[PDB]
A paper describes a structure:
We solved the structure of the Mei-P26 NHL domain at 1.6 Å resolution by molecular replacement using the backbone of the previously determined Brat NHL domain as a reference model. Mei-P26 NHL folds into a six-bladed β-propeller with a donut-like shape and a diameter of ∼45 Å and a height of ∼25 Å. The two molecules located in the asymmetric unit are connected by a di-sulfide bond between Cys1030, but the functional relevance of this dimerization under reducing conditions in vivo remains questionable. The six blades are asymmetrically distributed in a radial fashion around a central axis. Each unit is composed of four antiparallel β-strands connected by loops of various length and degrees of flexibility. In the center of the molecule the six β-sheets form a solvent-filled channel with a diameter of ∼12 Å. The overall structure is stabilized by a β-sheet complementation of the first N-terminal β-strand (aa 933–940) with the sixth sheet (aa 1178–1202) in a molecular velcro-like fashion. The N terminus of the NHL domain remains invisible because of averaging of its conformations throughout the crystal but is present as there was no indication of proteolytic degradation during purification and crystallization. As with Brat and Lin41, the NHL domain of Mei-P26 and Thin/Abba also exhibit a highly positively charged patch on their top surface. There is, however, one notable exception: three amino acids important for the recognition of the first position of the RNA target by Brat (a uridine base interacting with Asn800, Tyr829, and Arg847) are conserved in Mei-P26 (Asn970, Tyr 999, and Arg1017).
The TRIM-NHL protein Meiotic P26 (Mei-P26) acts as a regulator of cell fate in Drosophila. Its activity is critical for ovarian germline stem cell maintenance, differentiation of oocytes, and spermatogenesis. Mei-P26 functions as a post-transcriptional regulator of gene expression; however, the molecular details of how its NHL domain selectively recognizes and regulates its mRNA targets have remained elusive. The TRIM-NHL protein family shares a common architecture that comprises an N-terminal tripartite motif (TRIM, consisting of a RING domain, one or two B-Box type zinc fingers and a coiled-coil domain) followed by a C-terminal NCL-1, HT2A, and LIN-41 (NHL) domain.
Numbering used by the authors: 931 to 1203
Write the structure that this text describes.
Amino acid sequence: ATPMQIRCKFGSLGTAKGQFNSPHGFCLGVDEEIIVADTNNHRIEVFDKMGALKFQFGVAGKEEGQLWYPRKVAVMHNNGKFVVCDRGNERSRMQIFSKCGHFMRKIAIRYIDIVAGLAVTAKGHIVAVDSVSPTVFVISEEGELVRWFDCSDYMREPSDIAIRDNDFYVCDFKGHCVAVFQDDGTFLYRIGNEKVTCFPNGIDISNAGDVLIGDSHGNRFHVACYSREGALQSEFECPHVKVSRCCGLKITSEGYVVTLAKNNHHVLVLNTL
């Protein structure tokens, strides 16, 4: 496996600016800021790629505009708005914030149990995948349910999702693979398997269209790189350092790999050797 080096490791357990408490999700921003859903502190934290905090937003609570254990975050490429999913009254809740972090609106998602994966398409549609009843939902910026399709026959437990142009690649945490769907919802094929991609919890798609699938089975961060059609190209690991368990996977334009060490309350930015 090709080694990965630590380019930046930032965060520690706490409440202070730049600290985390069990962060469950992250994304990249319009300017590829590292944007973290700092779950147990009820806030979003926005960083540059060397871990410098730009700003944070979020007050703990269940009022509209407040955050309550936010676990997933995405940014709308065309206007910088944040899409944040947390726990509302009883069930999951989706809220839209401005690029300043100001509450704009709540999107009713009573048809979703758990948001296990969150992404935004090129056209500006919000994609949320449910892990309990495996289902994909495509949602407009103004809250319209544009499309949904059932994937329970083809998936066990979704854990992340990525989109390239118009197909959906869904991480199957308990299926040990990625499931590929069209925008139609028509299933196409799977990428990976239990040998290489064990308990995958992160996926992103390189510019070239390759599929990067992250896992931390051996308590070290491992990445498998597949072609768009499912041919294993390479594997990556951090052999010279003992990386913790991680979740999520995003590729920066430089080719750096970003993941979240949820159980150790920090972000990792990695480069290939």
